[PDB]
């Protein structure tokens, strides 16, 4: 009974919050990424990196606070507290955006710690590890968006900043610069997310409305017992209902529940692949054949051509303030505008 | 039995491969009318003067579009909320120019999709089920009413309804953000929580059930053959799944009642999508998302920009560029 | 020479056929615009 | 429209190659005892 086995005994004790070996990684990294986010959004400015106020201390609200990305001049510097940029000065580290990399890096290692927790608990209780496998999708999204996307770009500055409206800026940046709505990988993502919410809604509603009467109450939640062997709802009735309403229906409960794993997980993976492309500006920006035609035929107009003009407006009107390292001076006469507005 | 009693028994018959029903006698002609017209319009309709400014937009495949850029273009701004059926036009060529197909499609569609909801009630009644699948469907239904009907009504024109195409959808979204700041509206934010949470919960429930499947098969066969259609036994160990997920988080965070769990899976995306639909339908009356432009002011009075101010620049760029020849006066009022 | 005992029959049921074909046709319909460009 | 000259063959094979793969596996499943 060595010291490893006694430490393993303690880490795997049945307690209120299970720890585990993964908890050594997970619990400090998650706490710091969470705590770094609250600290930065409560007290930390973005004045020197972005020229923005981003904290409750400066007057922002929950929608507008953020821990913003470091300055573009930092490149992809790890921005360690002891690194050559902050030189151990905590105050300067906060001013240079070191909390962004702190949250991103500890968030990354925490997410690893969380998937390791999923494996560890599934192995201890004796279930298959599909929940960890399904968690690969949010990890793939986090890694592609928060790490691979800025690594492909000029600096961490162009990553998403950890804030509500800051994320909204990230969304509108991707429309205006990348035409990301046109990207078939994003479209697959949308289908997986919306298809996932549909399956969530329809499966929940189908189970609740094909329940067997297992008790006398009109509120039907009491009629379930977790030790029952019997199905609590009628798969046969559900199948007949959906086959007659929609044409097709599930008839295998295992395939149904796998498909529910598969749909949102595949969608998020597809979107991650699209974002990796956008790291290198490999956009699905334009359809070459329409651009050739629109250039030569000034009467050819489509919803795609209209969207490109919207995108040109986004870039011109947002770039001077969104990218203050560039020192864009766009005089009023160069800004694209339609008539009147 | 007379002919009417025989017909009623056919209509409400549970033995029909697809259930007709009384809602079905409306749903079927309306949806076939909307589908046929959509397919023909998407392939072959000539350009439509959406903005009422004699600047027709090409929406169909034959007129230069692909699957992604093609659309059924909304009816003309000159028509407004006026009902524009085929008989009101002097010719089909005029009906086509003014965007007649759009009004025909969305009206038949919305009538048809409303009856789809009723038909879901109807069959559940005929089958002895509980009746509330239709309530779940009322979330996407309300969303469709929001973008096709309520938004045009509050804005005063079916030209502001969402186009029936993929890039047309994106144009609708971008302009909407420009004009209403939808991202900063809490109803849209609840919509996002509804759909991200819904996809999350879909993944979670799928994964936990799949993880707890009881062994009935070997390695050389799909584990899905472990379930037989209409078997009485549970095919997964919900006590094992609760024992996992309550150790993943903590014990009281995890459902042990399958009925509660499935209600939550219903209620979360449905309530979230209801808020999304109400978001669109209330921005139809120009109650917009939060405006924090210049909310942060220094001691002198200098504007200190926030992330909301950066959003506003992007919003301005879409606003100044959208419908670039349609505006004659300084304020975009509807 | 004795036959190989690791050989296994392969199956694809009809619903899997319909699902796969749905998948392939929808990916085709989705990506076709990008392939033509 | 001036489209990619390889878009038709790319689409035709992207359809036909995995579709025939699934058809092959379906048909030989049905013919098993």
């Amino acid at each position: 009974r060595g010291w490893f086995d006694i430490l393993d005994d303690w880490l795997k004790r049945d307690r209120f919050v299970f720890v585990g070996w993964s908890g050594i990684l997970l619990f400090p990294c998650a706490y710091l990424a969470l705590g770094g986010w609250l600290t930065g959004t409560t007290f930390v400015t973005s004045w020197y990196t972005h020229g923005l106020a981003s904290s409750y201390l400066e007057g922002c609200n929950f929608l507008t606070v953020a821990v913003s990305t470091p300055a573009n001049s930092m490149g992809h510097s790890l921005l360690l507290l002891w690194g050559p940029e902050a030189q151990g000065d905590f105050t300067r580290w906060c001013q240079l955006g070191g909390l962004w990399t702190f949250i991103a890096l500890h968030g990354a290692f925490g997410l690893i710690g969380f998937m390791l927790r999923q494996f560890e608990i599934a192995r201890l209780v004796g279930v298959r590890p599909y929940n960890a496998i399904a968690f690969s999708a949010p990890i793939a999204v986090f890694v592609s968006v928060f790490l691979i996307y800025p690594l492909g770009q000029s600096s961490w500055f162009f990553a998403p900043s950890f804030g509500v409206a800051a994320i909204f800026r990230f969304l509108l940046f991707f429309q205006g610069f990348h035409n990301w709505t046109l990207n078939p990988f994003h479209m697959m993502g949308v289908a997986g997310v919306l298809g996932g919410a549909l399956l969530c809604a329809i499966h929940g509603a189908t189970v609740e409305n094909t329940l067997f009467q297992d008790g006398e109450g009109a509120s039907t939640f009491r009629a379930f017992n977790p030790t029952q062997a019997e199905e609590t709802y009628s798969m046969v009735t559900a199948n007949r209902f959906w086959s007659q309403i929609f044409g097709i229906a599930f008839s295998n409960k295992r395939w149904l529940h796998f498909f529910m794993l598969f749909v949102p997980v595949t969608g998020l993976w597809m979107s991650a692949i699209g974002v990796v492309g956008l790291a290198l500006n490999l956009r699905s920006y334009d359809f070459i054949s329409q651009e050739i035609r629109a250039a030569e035929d000034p009467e050819f107009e489509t919803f795609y051509t209209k969207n490109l003009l919207l995108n040109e407006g986004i870039r011109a009107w947002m770039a001077p303030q969104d990218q203050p390292h560039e020192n864009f001076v766009f005089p009023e006469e160069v800004l694209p505008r339609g008539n009147a507005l | 039995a007379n002919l009417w009693e025989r017909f009623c028994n056919w209509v409400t018959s549970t033995d029909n491969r697809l259930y007709v029903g009384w809602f079905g006698v409306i749903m079927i002609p309306t949806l076939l009318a909307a589908t046929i017209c959509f397919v023909i319009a998407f392939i072959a309709a000539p350009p439509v003067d959406i903005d009422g400014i004699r600047e027709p937009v090409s929406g169909s495949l034959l007129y230069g579009n692909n699957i992604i850029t093609g659309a059924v273009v909304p009816s003309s701004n000159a028509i407004g909320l006026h009902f524009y059926p085929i008989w009101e036009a002097a010719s089909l060529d005029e009906w086509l120019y003014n965007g007649g197909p759009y009004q025909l499609i969305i009206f038949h569609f919305l009538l048809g999709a409303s009856c789809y909801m009723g038909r879901q009630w109807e069959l559940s009644y005929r089958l002895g089920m509980r009746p509330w699948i239709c309530v779940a469907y009322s979330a996407p239904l309300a969303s469709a009413f929001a973008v096709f009907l309520i938004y045009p009504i509050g804005q005063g024109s079916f030209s502001d309804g969402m186009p029936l195409g993929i890039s047309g959808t994106f144009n609708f979204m971008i302009v909407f953000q420009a004009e209403h700041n939808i991202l900063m509206h809490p109803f849209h934010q609840l919509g996002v929580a509804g759909v991200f949470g819904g996809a999350l919960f879909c993944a979670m429930h799928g994964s936990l059930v799949t993880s707890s499947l009881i062994r009935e098969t070997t390695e050389t066969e799909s584990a899905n053959y472990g379930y037989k259609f209409g078997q009485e036994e549970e095919t997964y160990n919900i006590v094992a799944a609760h024992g996992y997920f309550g150790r993943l988080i903590f014990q009281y965070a995890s459902f042990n009642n399958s009925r509660s769990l499935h209600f939550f899976l219903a209620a979360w995306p449905v309530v979230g999508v209801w808020f999304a639909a109400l978001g669109i339908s209330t921005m139809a009356f120009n109650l917009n998302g939060f405006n924090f432009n210049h909310s942060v002011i220094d001691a002198k009075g200098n504007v200190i920009n926030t992330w909301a101010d950066i959003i506003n620049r992007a919003n301005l760029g879409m606003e100044v560029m959208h419908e670039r020849n349609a505006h004659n006066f300084p304020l975009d009022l509807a | 020479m004795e036959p190989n005992p690791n050989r296994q029959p392969v199956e694809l049921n009809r619903t899997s056929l319909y699902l796969g074909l749905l998948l392939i046709l929808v990916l085709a319909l989705l990506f076709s615009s990008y392939f033509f460009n | 429209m001036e489209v990619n000259q390889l878009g038709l063959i790319a689409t035709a094979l992207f359809v036909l190659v995995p579709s025939v793969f699934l058809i092959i596996l379906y048909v030989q499943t049905e013919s098993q005892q």
Binding site: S251 | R17, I43, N66, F229 | L25, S32 | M1
Partner: peptide, 30 residues
């Protein structure tokens, strides 16, 4: 060619709907 290709793929999908509905493997209670 483009228009024909898109309509062709679409028409196959509609056909697949027809077979998936009217020629499914019938759910059998066992």
């Amino acid at each position: 060619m483009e228009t024909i290709t898109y309509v062709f793929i679409f028409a196959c999908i509609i056909a697949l709907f027809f077979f998936a509905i009217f020629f499914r493997e019938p759910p059998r209670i066992t």
